[PDB]
Amino acid sequence: ESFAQLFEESLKEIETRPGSIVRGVVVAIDKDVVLVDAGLKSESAIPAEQFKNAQGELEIQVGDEVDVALDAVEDGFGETLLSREKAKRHEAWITLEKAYEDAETVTGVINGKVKGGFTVELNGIRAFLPGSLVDVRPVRDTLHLEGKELEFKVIKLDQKRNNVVVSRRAVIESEDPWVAIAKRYPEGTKLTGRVTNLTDYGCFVEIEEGVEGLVHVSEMDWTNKNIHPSKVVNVGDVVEVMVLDIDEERRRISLGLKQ
Amino acid sequence: SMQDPIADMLTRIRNGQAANKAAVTMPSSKLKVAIANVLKEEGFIEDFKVEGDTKPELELTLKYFQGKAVVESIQRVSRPGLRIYKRKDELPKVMAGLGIAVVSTSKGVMTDRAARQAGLGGEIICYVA
Amino acid sequence: TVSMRDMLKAGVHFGHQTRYWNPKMKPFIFGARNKVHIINLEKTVPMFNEALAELNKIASRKGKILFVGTKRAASEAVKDAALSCDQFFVNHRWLGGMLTNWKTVRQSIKRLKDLETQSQDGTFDKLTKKEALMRTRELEKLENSLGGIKDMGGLPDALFVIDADHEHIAIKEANNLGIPVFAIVDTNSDPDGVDFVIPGNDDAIRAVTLYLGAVAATVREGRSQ
Amino acid sequence: ELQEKLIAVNRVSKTVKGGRIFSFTALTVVGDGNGRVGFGYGKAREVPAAIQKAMEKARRNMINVALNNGTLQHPVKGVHTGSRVFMQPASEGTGIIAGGAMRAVLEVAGVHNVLAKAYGSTNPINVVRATIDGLENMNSPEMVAAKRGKSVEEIL
Amino acid sequence: PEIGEEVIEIKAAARDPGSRAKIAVKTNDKRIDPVGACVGMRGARVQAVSTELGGERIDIVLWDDNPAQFVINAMAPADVASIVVDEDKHTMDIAVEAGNLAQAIGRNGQNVRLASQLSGWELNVMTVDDLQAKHQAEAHAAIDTFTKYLDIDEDFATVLVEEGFSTLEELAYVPMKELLEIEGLDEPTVEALRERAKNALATIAQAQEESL
RNA sequence: CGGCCCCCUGGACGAAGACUGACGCUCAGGUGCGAAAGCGUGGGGAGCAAACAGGAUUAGAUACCCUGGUAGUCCACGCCGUAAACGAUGUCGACUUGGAGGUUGUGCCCUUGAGGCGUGGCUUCCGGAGCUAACGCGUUAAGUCGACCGCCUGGGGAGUAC
RNA sequence: GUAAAGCGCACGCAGGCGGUUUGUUAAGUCAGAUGUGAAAUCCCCGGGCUCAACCUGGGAACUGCAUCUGAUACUGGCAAG
């Protein structure tokens, strides 16, 4: 009756769009596809590579629950955008928690400055940093034991572009993209960027606040023409890329990957 | 411009029958009302309902028997471009009597059979089958 | 028989997106949630019950039921359902003109049966290797295609289908011959050819399974009767 | 009990690398002398086979027609593609006044008395189809009464 | 060959080889016509079986639906009009007219047995008048049994059994609201009179206790 | 109809209200506007380029290609009144399932963000019913109807002769 | 639309058509009557030439026009909205 109408609004009330409500129960595993059901129109064709943790083997059997992501519906049949992105929100919450007490305390091990700043990795993911943040002072972890264990103390974050730089050592110590597009510019600032779609001439890695990069086809590897990008890297993966070139005018930042 | 209201009525009805519309609405007029009443009497429609004071809206309710529509055919005969008037002997028979022909007469608008019974002809509005 | 809560749990109420729908399904739709159509369970349930009753009646008079799903997600399940009530099924690609052009396919069935016999009952082994491999391959092909319908004999007396738009060929065949059709019809699908439509999520696995299980139970009941 | 009339047979060609391959089309119609009627349009390299096919096809997909005694229930029009057809019920004794393919279908249908003209095209195939259409759409008094929620005497 | 390719549904073949061989057959509604195919051009295939194993009166009946239509079909080739029914042993009571009974019955010991196995059970060929004769021999008896059911006054019982269909024998399980339309229905008493009949049945069971 | 500016100027759409109160639709004759080429008179003339000249090509090449090159193209004021002036689809009005866009308004909504929910105008593509000889058209109809006009009646002769 | 056939586009007189409600009129419209609509011809029922053609009695028809008396739904006129 209005039973059903009340239920419809109830079920509205007890779900949300993003990957927030850990609801999808893993109802079939086979390699290389995991599948869930989060109260959506269809079941998600999940990769296995969203769900193996830090050493390469699976961690969740049948019945286990992780939320995925939404706001994109039915490319022709199916439902979702993947769940690790959901994990990105949890990582963002942990990073924000710092604000409360002005200190987020984890493990942070930064061996080398990709784009000027040491790369700091939190449990599964690894993020890239600006130079100063790796070290509180000129200490320079190159003389520290390789991949050492301290923490991360935040020096700098870009706040729209997920670039976060953190201070590994020294426990005692405690429109918009295109006007000032000179930050990752100079010649060779490398970046950690997720690829989006490979257009058979390109890969379209683009992460840094609403920009677009192309590592198109020529570099990508150390073979030129017989390469077919889909074979050689991935879909949806954070990689080594750097700028190599910027247009601020015709908005074509032409990244590379042969580096 | 709108020149023939009745014909517009009939077309609306036809389109509703085609499209399996339950009910068909349109601005009301007295002649339209009477036509609707005649149809209801002759059972091609379920019920008609006028509603409104300043600009009232006639709403007919269409009829469907075993899926398909009831009003198999509905044509104007008289039209502004060319009027048709018939004398009682000359009155027609739609579908060999199975259908009807709405005819306006001095004593009101009625089906062709009714007019014949009365003993008078008039302006042939529309055939319905 | 099948309750509304269970259907909701399964995910029947979910239906395709709002750019992929069919306006003939507008009656069966309730609303559109997050730019996805919702099927009206209030209107779905009674008709599903009806369809079940008809299927039962068919069974009671010793009717032959054919279960069609070639979605390759619920192929396993449709086969399982068919077997539970020992009825017939087409879980892989429907052969164009399986029913209309039965007489030809009947030979196909016969060849398959003969091959099966050779494989099993003969116990003759001693066959040229390549030839033996070829015969095996033929067996596999024919099993995949016509495994469920091999014991069918003639033409079914009713046709249960999991997706109308996907199996429209089978539906059209049934209509041409006049076989009763019992279709699960999502919002994108066309239900005009269907006799006993069923608005439900053809895609979701659990919903499909639920549909199948109730159908199987009512077939078994009719057989018992 | 069924009667069957081959209306027409026509030779049709297909050009190939060698030359012209000829074949034959057979347009037949069958009926039981009552409401029921069905046409078939067969094709084969030889004539008898093609007519056999036409008979087979006609025998299936038949269609019923509501006949008031020997004639029709009211004037009816039917069209198909070019062939537009008018046919009109007529008094006993008049016979089938109709031309060609149309005639044939009427006879098998078991109508005995009609006045009937084929306007437009007279392509046998299309015109027989149009006839069948006019016969199918034609409804009876009882049918219209049912449609309209009345008795037969109300409609007369 | 249609039957061979599952096109002519042939269930039972209640026939008497050496005399008459009438058998009904069903078909999936698809412009097939089962008997027609079994007969052929002017009994083309019918003649084959006619002079097959020996001069036999082979017959084909267009099976309609269920067992009710099988009854009449089993009376063919003749003219059935009506028939009675029951439970396990329904006993199809053939209801025809004397004039048509001559052919319907055909031979005392021939069509009475050939059509008996037609339905698989047994038939009881009767007459149109016979039916009515037995029909009334049933109305009086739910009454024609010394009235051992409800019972009250007799003057009211006559006026009640006038309108009463099938007497009162176990009639409480039927519509308990149409006898209230009868001129004279205040408080539930006739609805109670039927209850008395139910009590009479219990009394009859008590009589069985008197005898068992 | 295309660089900016200014001056004069026509239409369209939306938002609410307020007013008039059928004043409307169509239109034979009639009147006006009407690409390019073309004409007249007077200016102008960079580039391009009918005509023309030479060089090639070719059997020939009164062409295609190359080198030049004048009318014209440009401006002012007149005339011409035609084009595959095409959506090869007259104008006006009403009604009939959908999807994906573009553009331009406008109402509400926490714009919590580039958004969310509507509601108007114009517009591109696909496609349902229906229509169609088929191709296709398909709420911008070639569907279902009404009003008015224009036009067609085998091909040529001929849109020519008088 | 492509078969012949949408003026290149507009404005616009004459002309054609005209939202909705009430009142009135009664021109159109419808009904009835009267007068006429020559006879012959056509058609119906009959009759006479042996039949037929042919002749012939009576009817019907001559779809119209004119008038008078009504009807007023529609169209028109007039008056108010």
For position D37, which CATH number holds? 3.30.160.20
The strand ranges marked E within chain A are 28-30, 33-35, 46-47, 117-121, 126-129, 154-157, 164-166, 193-194, 238-239
List D117's β-bridge partners, or say none: D86
Residue D34 in any domain: the answer is: yes
Interface test with E, best of C110, C155, C175 (most E CBs within 10 A): C155
Give residues with Cβ within 8 angstroms of A119, minimum separation 6.
A110, A111, A112, A113, A126, A127, A128, A129, A192
Cβ atoms within 10 Å, residue C191: 23
Residue of E nearest to D57 (CA): E31
Residue range of the domain that includes E160: 131-209
Shortest CA gap A42–chain C (Å):
5
Contact with chain A for residue C30, Cβ under 8 A:
yes
**A24: its two tokens:** 């999808």
* DSSP type of residue E71: H
User: Which residue is associated with the tokens 């339209």?
Assistant: B32
Q: Which of B65, B70, B96 sits opposite D74 (nearest CB)?
A: B96
CB contact under 8 A, E6 and C103: no
Q: Which of A1, A7, A40 sits opposite C14 (nearest CB)?
A: A40
CB contact under 8 A, A74 and C16: yes
- Collapsing DSSP to helix, strand or coil, A68 comes out as coil
Residue range of the domain that includes D11: 3-63
Q: Is E2 exposed, middle or buried (0-12, 13-18, 19+ CB in 10 A)?
A: middle
User: Which residue is associated with the tokens 């200190």?
Assistant: A103
Rounded CA gap, A188 and A254, in Å? 11
In the structure, do chain E and chain D come into contact, i.e. share 3 or more CB pairs under 8 Å? yes
CA atoms within 13 A on the CB side of E89: 4
Give CA separation, E37 vs B85, D52, E154, in Å: 59, 17, 64
**B52: its two tokens:** 């409104």
- Between the two ends of chain B, the Cα-to-Cα distance in Å is 29
Cβ-contact C161, C184 below 8 angstroms: yes
Question: In terms of DSSP bridges, do strands A46-47 and B122-128 run parallel, antiparallel, or are they unpaired?
Answer: unpaired
- Which runs of consecutive H residues, i.e. helices, occur in chain C? 4-10, 41-60, 75-84, 102-117, 129-146, 168-177, 205-224
Shortest CA gap D147–chain B (Å):
6
Nearest nucleotide, CA B29 to C1': G20
Cβ atoms within 10 Å, residue A49: 14
Residue whose C-alpha is closest to residue D138's, from D90, D95, D77, D81: D77
Give partners of A (≥3 CB pairs < 8 A). C
Residues ending a continuous segment of chain D before a break (C–N > 2.5 Å): none
Q: Which of C106, C153, C177 sits opposite E30 (nearest CB)?
A: C177
Cβ-contact D4, D55 below 8 angstroms: yes
Q: Is A184 exposed, middle or buried (0-12, 13-18, 19+ CB in 10 A)?
A: buried
Residue D156 in any domain: the answer is: no
D59: which chain E residues are within 8 Å (Cβ-Cβ)? 31
Query: Do D16 and D28 belong to one domain?
Result: yes
Question: In terms of DSSP bridges, do strands B68-69 and B74-76 run parallel, antiparallel, or are they unpaired?
Answer: unpaired
Cβ-contact B61, B108 below 8 angstroms: no
Residue D41 in any domain: the answer is: yes
The strand ranges marked E within chain E are 20-25, 57-62, 95-96, 126-127
Q: Which helix (H) or strand (E) holds C29?
A: strand C29-32
Cβ-contact D59, D40 below 8 angstroms: yes
Cβ-contact E58, E46 below 8 angstroms: yes
Residue whose C-alpha is closest to residue E24's, from E38, E10, E37, E36: E10
Query: Do D75 and D134 belong to one domain?
Result: yes
Give CA separation, A193 vs A68, A118, A203, A208, B4, in Å: 20, 16, 11, 8, 69
Cβ atoms within 10 Å, residue D84: 18
Give residues with Cβ within 8 angstroms of A105, minimum separation 6.
A151
CB contact under 8 A, B98 and D89: no
- Collapsing DSSP to helix, strand or coil, A157 comes out as strand
User: Which residue is associated with the tokens 């670039």?
Assistant: A163
Q: Which of C20, C40, C41 sits opposite A74 (nearest CB)?
A: C20
Q: Which helix (H) or strand (E) holds E197?
A: helix E190-211
Rounded CA gap, A75 and E16, in Å? 69
B72: which chain D residues are within 8 Å (Cβ-Cβ)? 139
A72 C-beta less than 7 Å away from strand F: no
E46: which chain D residues are within 8 Å (Cβ-Cβ)? none
Rounded CA gap, D29 and D47, in Å? 16
Distance of CA D12 to the CA centre of its chain: 23
**Domain C102-146 fold:** Helix Hairpins (1.10.287)
Cβ-contact A48, A58 below 8 angstroms: yes
CB contact under 8 A, C155 and E28: yes
3-state SS record for chain D: CCEEEEEEEEEEEEECCCCEEEEEEEEEEEECCCCCEEEEEEEECCHHHHHHHHHHHHHCCCECCCCECCECCCCEEEEECCEEEEEEECCCCCCEECCCHHHHHHHHHCCCCEEEEEEECCCHHHHHHHHHHHHHHCCCHHHHHHHHCCCHHHHC
In the structure, do chain D and chain B come into contact, i.e. share 3 or more CB pairs under 8 Å? yes
Q: Which helix (H) or strand (E) holds E135?
A: helix E128-139
Of all residues in chain A, what percent are helix, strand and coil, respectively (each to 5)?
15, 15, 70
Rounded CA gap, B96 and D88, in Å? 10
Give partners of B (≥3 CB pairs < 8 A). D
Query: Do D28 and D54 belong to one domain?
Result: yes
Rounded CA gap, A225 and C185, in Å? 48
Rounded CA gap, C37 and C17, in Å? 6
CB contact under 8 A, E30 and D60: yes
User: Which residue is associated with the tokens 């919002």?
Assistant: C187
Residues ending a continuous segment of chain B before a break (C–N > 2.5 Å): none
Question: In terms of DSSP bridges, do strands C181-184 and C196-198 run parallel, antiparallel, or are they unpaired?
Answer: parallel
Residue ending a domain, among D41, D63, D85, is: D63
CB contact under 8 A, B70 and D74: no
Cβ-contact A70, A19 below 8 angstroms: yes
Give CA separation, A117 vs A120, A127, A156, C151, D102, in Å: 9, 10, 10, 72, 91
Query: Do D58 and D83 belong to one domain?
Result: no
Residue whose C-alpha is closest to residue A233's, from A255, A259, A213, A203: A203
Residue whose C-alpha is closest to residue D113's, from D132, D136, D137, D88: D88
Cβ-based contacts under 8 A for chains B and D: 29
Rounded CA gap, A79 and D73, in Å? 59
C31: which chain A residues are within 8 Å (Cβ-Cβ)? 8
Give residues with Cβ within 8 angstroms of A208, minimum separation 6.
A158, A161, A163, A177, A184, A191, A193
Which CATH entry fits the domain spanning B5-69: 3.40.50.150, 1.10.10.10, 3.30.1370.30, 3.30.1330.60? 3.30.1370.30
B95: which chain D residues are within 8 Å (Cβ-Cβ)? 74-75
Strand F-contacting residues in B 51-90, CB cut-off 7 angstroms: 75-76, 79-82
CATH number at residue E151: 1.10.150.20
**Residue whose CA is minimally distant from G31 C1':** B120
List A164's β-bridge partners, or say none: A157
Question: Length of chain E in residues, anyone?
Answer: 212
List C29's β-bridge partners, or say none: C39
Cβ-contact A234, A224 below 8 angstroms: no
**A191: its two tokens:** 């970046």
Residue ending a domain, among D63, D82, D113, is: D63
Rounded CA gap, A169 and D129, in Å? 92
3-state SS record for chain B: CCCCHHHHHHHHHHHHHHCCCCEEEEECCHHHHHHHHHHHHCCCEEEEEEECCCCCEEEEEECEECCEECCCCEEECCECCECCEECHHHCCCHHHHCCEEEEEECCEEEEHHHHHHHCCCEEEEEEEC
- Rounded CA–C1' distance between B87 and G36, in angstroms: 22
Strand F-contacting residues in C 11-70, CB cut-off 7 angstroms: 18-19, 21, 23-24, 26, 35
Q: How many domains does chain D have?
A: 2
CB contact under 8 A, B98 and D146: no
| Backbone torsions φ then ψ of A137, nearest 5 degrees | -125, -170
Cβ atoms within 10 Å, residue A203: 29
Cβ-based contacts under 8 A for chains D and E: 6
Give residues with Cβ within 8 angstroms of E189, minimum separation 6.
none
Cβ-contact A13, A26 below 8 angstroms: no
Question: Length of chain D in residues, anyone?
Answer: 156
Which C positions 182-221 lie with beta carbon below 8 A of chain A?
201, 203-206
Query: Per residue in D89-128, is it b (16+ CB within 10 Å) or e — as a string?
Result: bbeeeeebebeebbbbbbbbbbbbbbbbebeebebbbbbb
List E58's β-bridge partners, or say none: E21
Rounded CA gap, B106 and B115, in Å? 10
Contact with chain E for residue D57, Cβ under 8 A:
no
In CATH, what number does B74-128 get?
3.30.1490.10
Peptide bond preceding C80 in cis form (omega within 30 of 0): no
Angle between helices C205-224 and C41-60 (to 10 degrees): 40
Residues of chain B with CATH 3.30.1490.10: 74-128
CB contact under 8 A, C33 and A8: yes
CA atoms within 13 A on the CB side of E155: 0
Cβ atoms within 10 Å, residue A189: 18
The strand ranges marked E within E16-174 are 20-25, 57-62, 95-96, 126-127
Angle at C20 between CA C18 and CA C21, to 5 degrees: 75
Rounded CA gap, C162 and C68, in Å? 6
Query: Do D121 and D75 belong to one domain?
Result: yes
Strand F-contacting residues in C 161-180, CB cut-off 7 angstroms: none
Contact with chain D for residue B46, Cβ under 8 A:
no
Residue of C nearest to E30 (CA): C177
C204: which chain A residues are within 8 Å (Cβ-Cβ)? 37, 41-43
Cβ-contact B33, B55 below 8 angstroms: no
E6: which chain C residues are within 8 Å (Cβ-Cβ)? 153-155
**A2: its two tokens:** 């209005």
- Rounded CA–C1' distance between D122 and F154, in angstroms: 20
Nearest nucleotide, CA B6 to C1': F146
Rounded CA gap, E93 and E146, in Å? 28
**Strand G: which bases are under 7 Å from protein Cβ?**
16-22, 28-32, 70-75
- Which runs of consecutive H residues, i.e. helices, occur in chain A? 2-13, 84-101, 229-232
| Backbone torsions φ then ψ of A119, nearest 5 degrees | -85, 130
Strand F-contacting residues in B 102-121, CB cut-off 7 angstroms: none
- Collapsing DSSP to helix, strand or coil, A167 comes out as coil
* DSSP type of residue A195: B
Which E positions 39-98 lie with beta carbon below 8 A of chain D?
none
Nearest nucleotide, CA D121 to C1': F133
Query: Per residue in C149-183, is it b (16+ CB within 10 Å) or e — as a string?
Result: bbebeebbbbbbbbbbbbbbbbbebbeebebbbbb
E30: which chain D residues are within 8 Å (Cβ-Cβ)? 60
